[PDB]
PDB file of N, CA and C in Angstrom:
ATOM      1  N   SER Q 373       1.007 -85.567 -35.559  1.00 60.58           N
ATOM      2  CA  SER Q 373       1.870 -86.529 -34.822  1.00 60.58           C
ATOM      3  C   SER Q 373       1.048 -87.588 -34.048  1.00 60.58           C
ATOM      4  N   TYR Q 374       1.744 -88.608 -33.527  1.00 61.85           N
ATOM      5  CA  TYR Q 374       1.175 -89.627 -32.648  1.00 61.85           C
ATOM      6  C   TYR Q 374       1.996 -89.648 -31.362  1.00 61.85           C
ATOM      7  N   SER Q 375       1.312 -89.679 -30.210  1.00 61.90           N
ATOM      8  CA  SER Q 375       1.953 -89.876 -28.906  1.00 61.90           C
ATOM      9  C   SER Q 375       1.236 -90.986 -28.141  1.00 61.90           C
ATOM     10  N   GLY Q 376       1.989 -91.981 -27.653  1.00 57.35           N
ATOM     11  CA  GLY Q 376       1.424 -93.069 -26.869  1.00 57.35           C
ATOM     12  C   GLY Q 376       1.860 -94.477 -27.247  1.00 57.35           C
ATOM     13  N   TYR Q 377       0.882 -95.401 -27.263  1.00 57.43           N
ATOM     14  CA  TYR Q 377       1.074 -96.843 -27.438  1.00 57.43           C
ATOM     15  C   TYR Q 377       0.231 -97.293 -28.629  1.00 57.43           C
ATOM     16  N   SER Q 378       0.856 -97.994 -29.569  1.00 55.72           N
ATOM     17  CA  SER Q 378       0.155 -98.618 -30.691  1.00 55.72           C
ATOM     18  C   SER Q 378       0.655-100.051 -30.902  1.00 55.72           C
TER      19      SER Q 378
END
């Protein structure tokens, strides 16, 4: 998964 700001 990805968590945060992109």
